[PDB]
Amino acid sequence: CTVQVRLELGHRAQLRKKPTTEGFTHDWMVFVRGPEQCDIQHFVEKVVFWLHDSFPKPRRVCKEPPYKVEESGYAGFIMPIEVHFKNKEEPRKVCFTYDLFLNLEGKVNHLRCEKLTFNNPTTEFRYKLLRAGGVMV
């Protein structure tokens, strides 16, 4: 028995009308979500966004939804994201390398779908999956 569930990683970034005291030109938000009609909270323990050096306390953790980070900045960067599962057996997380990229002349609305595949999950984990929109194959 194999269950597949869907994740959407994405971000929006708009160019500020006025930069901040520190010369931050953009506001952005990055997120992890289920597709429409999918609360991934049921099988997602927490999400960890490993921001760049320059943000204070850059290991950002969301234990409940929304799994998001809102900040201001001046540049884009590569960002590891780790989704940890409400699973007591392996696998207990998955990592994506996310590219938080900015539009210097306007906005960015970016979306990227990732399909997770869990093999022979435990009985109570297979719920969390199916409760979150999972599909059996």
């Binding site: 760049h52 320059s54 001046y74 540049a75 884009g76 960067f77 990229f101 900015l102 210097l104």
Partner: peptide
Amino acid sequence: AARK
């Protein structure tokens, strides 16, 4: 700076 764009991209750090």
